[PDB]
């Protein structure tokens, strides 16, 4: 399989990001339940929270208050930012190669 590395890694980052979103949702709820006042405690809204966290939006409607909930959050942020950054890098590599040919 000799397809462009930048597109492979971009695909890998996307799949991995989806995994992080699902795992993040699960682990956040597991971490936040048991803490009085915590709102990140049911899976559907936890997945929504993971999405806005990975994109860095966030709104402030949901967020973790525990140590482990916040650690999970940081992993989600980094994975999200890295993934989108890897797509941008792949796009640049594409454009650069095509401009040489042009």
């Amino acid at each position, epitope marked *: 399989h000799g397809s462009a590395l930048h597109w492979r890694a971009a695909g890998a980052a996307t799949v991995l990001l989806v995994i992080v979103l699902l795992a993040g949702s*699960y682990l956040a*709820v*597991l971490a*936040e*339940r*048991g*803490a*009085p*006042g*915590a*709102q990140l*405690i*049911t*899976y*559907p809204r936890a997945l929504w929270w993971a999405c806005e966290t990975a994109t860095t939006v966030x709104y402030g409607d949901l967020y973790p208050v525990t140590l482990w909930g916040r650690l999970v959050a940081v992993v989600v942020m980094v994975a999200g930012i890295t993934s989108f950054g890897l797509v941008t890098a792949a796009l640049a590599t594409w454009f650069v190669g095509r401009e040489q040919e042009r």
Partner: antibody
Framework: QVQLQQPGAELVKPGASVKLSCKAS????????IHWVKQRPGHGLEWIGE????????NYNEKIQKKATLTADKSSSTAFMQLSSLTSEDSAVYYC???????????WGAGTTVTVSS | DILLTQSPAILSVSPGERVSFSCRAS??????IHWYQQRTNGSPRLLIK???ESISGIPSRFSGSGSGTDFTLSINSVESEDIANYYC?????????FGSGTKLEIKR
């Protein structure tokens, strides 16, 4: 078919301890929580605690004194509640309930009537 | 923790009328309220989830409404099998809590 099976009754001597059971049936997911609810005669529902079988973590009501200890067994799909050092205050019906991690109690057990007496 | 207040504790109504149970939270909880029915010597049974969402198997005369702090469970044309205790439950913040309950009465 009956999703949550609980024994009908348990007789406990004052100061002793009992281990209640809740046997699960039907669809079981990784995101399932088993809750325990205490109801004294002629009174309302009181939330005791919760456990997630797929991970084993348990949380408890902090407003009340901790009398309970939640464990689970994935093999037998059974959740357990360990009530210890019981008095007459602890005499009640104890329901187990299943929550799909979306906030509500979809199904309840028939409840185990716990009587504490000598 | 979130306090849910159900007042009054007893509702008396003539057979066929529309009844409304009240549930008030000590703080805003969106629509994260669920309703349960418990008959004499029975286990609680889910009637309405997320304030207004209906459940399969539950008679269409049962409905729910409200958001924020004030929630209502309604029965269109009360009949004898509706005689029970009615509880609300919130899942907005940990820990989940229950209301104190409202008993339904029928003046036959």
């Amino acid at each position: 078919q009956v999703q949550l099976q609980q024994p009908g009754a348990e007789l406990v001597k004052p100061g002793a301890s009992v281990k209640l059971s809740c046997k699960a049936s039907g669809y079981t997911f990784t995101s399932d929580w088993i809750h325990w609810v205490k109801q004294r005669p002629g009174h309302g529902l009181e939330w005791i605690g919760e456990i997630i079988p797929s991970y084993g973590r348990a949380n408890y009501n902090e407003k009340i004194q901790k009398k309970a200890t939640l464990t689970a067994d994935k093999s037998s799909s059974t959740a357990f509640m360990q009530l210890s050092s019981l008095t007459s205050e602890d005499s009640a019906v104890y329901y187990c309930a299943r929550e799909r991690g979306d906030g509500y109690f979809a199904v309840w057990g028939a409840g185990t009537t716990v009587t504490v007496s000598s | 923790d979130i306090l849910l207040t159900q007042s009054p504790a007893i509702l008396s109504v003539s057979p066929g009328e529309r009844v409304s149970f009240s549930c008030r939270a000590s703080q805003s909880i969106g629509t994260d309220i669920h309703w349960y029915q418990q008959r004499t010597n029975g286990s609680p049974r889910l009637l309405i989830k997320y304030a207004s969402e209906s459940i399969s198997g539950i008679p269409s005369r049962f409905s729910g409404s409200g958001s924020g702090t004030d929630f209502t469970l309604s029965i269109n044309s009360v009949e004898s099998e509706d005689i029970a205790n009615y509880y609300c439950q919130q899942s907005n913040r940990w820990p989940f809590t229950f209301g104190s309950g409202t008993k339904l009465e029928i003046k036959r």
